[PDB]
């Protein structure tokens, strides 16, 4: 029943907690049924210990789902993102948000015309060349 | 996964593989880079709007019927009939056999979010015109916008106002043949099928390549250990590791070229979406044949479909000029 | 504020840094690969020549030659792809410099978000930086419009603009800056009849010539 | 100076309506 493991961690300069994602394996399998002297990865201290969430891109251990929406920080797959914020700081796994809803007003005899303007300056960086070498 | 593909979950095979250095840290980086590039490609094309606009409940745009492109709330997903027809024309034991170390990762953006993005673009381009490509959406009646667009191709705006009903009927009749022209001809969506066919065939060939002797006793590790003692069985198996590494190199080598080929088309699609949709184009034969007026995007599996509305002169008449 | 944004954000120049970062680890791996035995007795040629006779030395050193040749081929194979990837961006930058800098571009979202006005280039290590000046409309205001106006039983259309009213009097103004004006016989052109367009309104159009004329002609 | 020019008359809206009343 082999699978694959990925380590989701924030910056080590900031925190020291990690979340392990078992990709391609449902939660009910070995991920929550690990046994001593039975599995290849030596580290097993995480175990089940609650905070077990099922995702279409595998089962991840160490984060708790929150029914909110923020910009994607660390991509996971199938529309799930994780970050390191408050609920005393833990690791959450929310659903990616496309943006804020905005209903437009339409009428058959209405129009909108601006009265002022604004000047803005934006930047753009483009590579042009690479280093030369010889062997 | 190198270890399982090259070595049949053995131990001495892994010990011999360890002597080849970083011939797999290099192989495990290119694929991750390709995956990140693929994730960025779809985001660069569709994520061009700050907010998610929604159409007003009332839908009467002066005679133009946009029901064929607007989302359908009756269906479980917010997909237009054209989008469903496109989605039902691309088909994606072997899939459950690839336990040799070859997997497939799911895309970051779900199709139900690409549909939301497409709906937002459609609402913005049907309610505000091209004014929402610079700042916020600005109100304008649809006939006024169409008169504005006719004014950009050298035709006086009075032509639309004096022929509004006929133009609306022509547009409604023209948009009513795309569904038939797609449901009848099966080769229209032929470009998108190759993208998955090549990726399936490459994996199939890579899996089939595992049953090669490579100038050795046999292609089965257990069979070659059960017949020869270590001192020269170690030499014999080395041919298998060399051959499997050489075979695995070509796969990523071809994938690196295919990634660039796909990226070029993704950039072209992004440019088309930014120019033909969010505005009006003067470039000849860029947003269709004739004089470009408007465009609407639709979502397809691993691709995008554009609908170009153009202006084509009808029957002529010669004269005498000075 | 450009200088402040550059000095505050430490990851603005990320595209240029990747180009020079990818060209160092490649050489690092190419030089670290020299420590691999490649299935031989040792990774040192002198050690092999000092421990074995020529008849077997000429066999033991072939494996290292093949492995190093393969490791050298992979490097140039990847560099050839990276070179084309850089060349495509160089061509794009050349086109952008030709269009946005030496003129004004009508292409939407090509030389900045908004209505492009000007552009200036700036030199950077292994790259180039552009500065796009645009024009973004500020706060707006809704109004009430009408497709046409019919004064003497004849339809009238705006020559350049759109008819607009504040609720009491009708006006004509341009499409990107509010500037009301009185409808005259030179701001509009007559075409068609008074029963074809949908949504026309009844109003009058001023004629500058007639009052000054009959005032003077009398 | 023009090649292929033709001879015709251009109507001036000013003349009839502003001379009939000016009479």
Q: What's the gap in Å between the CA of B154 and the closest CA on chain D?
A: 25
Distance CA A57, CA B314 (A): 55
Cβ proximity of C118 and C133 under 8 Å: yes
Q: What's the gap in Å between the CA of A112 and the closest CA on chain B?
A: 5
Taking Cα atoms as reference points, which of B132, B123, B111, B139 lies closest to residue B53?
A: B123
Residues of C in contact with B138 (CB under 8 A): 140
Beta strand residue intervals within chain A, DSSP E: 5-8, 19-22, 52-55, 58-61, 64-70, 74-77, 80-85, 90-96, 101-103, 110-114, 117-127
Sheet with C127-137: list strands edge to edge.
A117-127, C127-137, C118-124
* CA B107 to each of CA A77, A79, B81, B94, B119: distance values in angstroms, whole numbers, following the listed order: 6, 8, 24, 21, 20
Distance CA B301, CA B268 (A): 17
Grouping H, G, I as helix, E, B as strand and the rest as coil, residue C72 is: helix
Residues of A in contact with C16 (CB under 8 A): 125, 127
A113 and chain C: CB distance < 8 Å anywhere?
A: yes
Cβ proximity of C148 and B161 under 8 Å: yes
* CA C85 to each of CA A131, B238, C26, C69: distance values in angstroms, whole numbers, following the listed order: 13, 36, 16, 25
Contact C74 B26 (CB under 8 A): yes
The beta-carbon neighbor of A116 closest among C2, C127, C139 is C139
| Residues whose CB is less than 8 angstroms from the CB of residue A101 and which lie 6 or more positions away in sequence, other chains included | B51, B52, B54
B143 and chain C: CB distance < 8 Å anywhere?
A: yes
Cβ proximity of B248 and B27 under 8 Å: yes
Give the neighbours of chain B: at least 3 Cβ pairs within 8 Å: A, C, D
Distance CA C15, CA B316 (A): 55
Give the resolution to one decimal, in Å.
3.5
> Which of D 1-20 lie inside 8 A of C, CB atoms?
18
Distance CA C129, CA B47 (A): 24
Question: Taking CA atoms, what residue in B is nearest to A100?
Answer: B51
> Which of C 157-216 lie inside 8 A of D, CB atoms?
209, 213-214
Sole residue written with tokens 């430490």:
C10
């Amino acid at each position: 029943s082999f699978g694959g493991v990925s380590v989701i961690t924030p910056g080590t300069n900031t925190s020291n907690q990690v979340a392990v994602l078992y990709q391609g394996v449902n939660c009910t399998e070995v991920p929550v049924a690990i046994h001593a002297d039975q599995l290849t990865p030596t580290w097993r201290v995480y175990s089940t210990g609650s905070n077990v969430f099922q995702t279409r891109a595998g089962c991840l251990i160490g984060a708790e789902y929150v029914n909110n929406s923020y910009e994607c920080d660390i991509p996971i797959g199938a529309g799930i993102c994780a970050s390191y914020q408050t609920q005393s700081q833990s690791i959450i796994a929310y659903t990616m948000s496309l943006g804020a809803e905005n209903s437009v007003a339409y009428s058959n005899n209405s129009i909108a015309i601006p009265t002022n303007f604004t000047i803005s300056v934006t930047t753009e960086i483009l590579p042009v060349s690479m280093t030369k070498t010889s062997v | 996964d190198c270890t399982m593909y090259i070595c049949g979950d053995s131990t001495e095979c892994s010990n011999l593989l360890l002597q080849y250095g970083s011939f797999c840290t290099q192989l495990k980086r290119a694929l991750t880079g390709i995956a990140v590039e693929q994730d960025k490609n779809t985001q660069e094309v569709f994520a061009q709007v700050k907010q998610i606009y929604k159409t007003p409940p009332i839908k009467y745009f002066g005679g133009f019927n946009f029901s064929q492109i607007l989302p359908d709330p009756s269906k479980p997903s917010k997909r237009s009939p054209i989008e469903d027809l496109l989605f039902n024309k691309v088909t994606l034991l072997i899939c459950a056999q690839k336990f040799n170390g070859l997997t497939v990762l799911p895309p970051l953006l779900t199709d139900e979010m690409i549909a939301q993005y497409t709906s937002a673009l459609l609402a913005g381009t049907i309610t505000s015109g091209w004014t929402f490509g610079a700042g916020p959406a600005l109100q304008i009646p649809f006939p006024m916008q169409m008169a504005y667009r006719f004014n950009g191709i050298g035709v006086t705006q009075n032509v639309l106002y004096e022929n509004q009903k006929l133009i609306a009927n022509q547009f409604n009749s023209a948009i009513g043949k795309i569904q038939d022209s797609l449901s009848s001809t099966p080769s229209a969506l032929g470009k998108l099928q190759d993208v998955v066919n090549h990726n399936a065939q490459a994996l199939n060939t890579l899996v089939k390549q595992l049953s090669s002797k490579f100038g050795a006793i046999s292609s089965v590790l257990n069979d070659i250990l059960s017949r020869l003692d270590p001192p020269e069985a170690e030499v014999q198996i080395d041919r298998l590791i060399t051959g499997r590494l050489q075979s695995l190199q070509t796969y990523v080598t071809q994938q690196l070229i295919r990634a660039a080929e796909i990226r070029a088309s993704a950039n072209l699609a992004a440019t088309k979406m930014s120019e033909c949709v969010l505005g009006q184009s003067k470039r000849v034969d860029f947003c269709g044949k004739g004089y470009h007026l408007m465009s609407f995007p639709q979502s397809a599996p691993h691709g995008v479909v554009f609908l170009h509305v153009t202006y084509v002169p009808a029957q002529e008449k010669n004269f005498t000029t000075a | 504020k450009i200088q402040d944004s550059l000095s505050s954000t430490p990851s603005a120049l990320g595209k240029l840094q990747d180009v020079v970062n990818h060209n160092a680890q490649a050489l690092n791996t190419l030089v670290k690969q020299l420590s691999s035995k490649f299935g031989a007795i040792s990774s040192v040629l002198n050690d092999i020549l000092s421990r074995l006779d020529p008849p077997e030395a000429e066999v033991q050193i072939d494996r290292l030659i093949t492995g190093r040749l393969q490791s050298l081929q992979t490097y140039v194979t990847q560099q050839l792809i990276r070179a084309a990837e850089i060349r495509a961006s160089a061509n794009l930058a050349a086109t952008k410099m030709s269009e946005c800098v030496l003129g004004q571009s009508k292409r939407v979202d090509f030389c900045g978000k908004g209505y492009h006005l000007m552009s200036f280039p700036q030199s950077a290590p292994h790259g180039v930086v552009f500065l796009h000046v645009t024009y973004v409309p500020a706060q707006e205001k809704n109004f009430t419009t009408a497709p046409a106006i019919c004064h003497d039983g004849k339809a009238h259309f705006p020559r350049e603009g759109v008819f607009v009213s504040n609720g009491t009097h009708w006006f004509v103004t341009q499409r990107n800056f509010y500037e009301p004006q009185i409808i005259t016989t030179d701001n509009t052109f007559v075409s068609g009849n008074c029963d074809v367009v949908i949504g026309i309104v009844n109003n009058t159009v001023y004629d500058p010539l007639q009052p000054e004329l009959d005032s003077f002609k009398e």
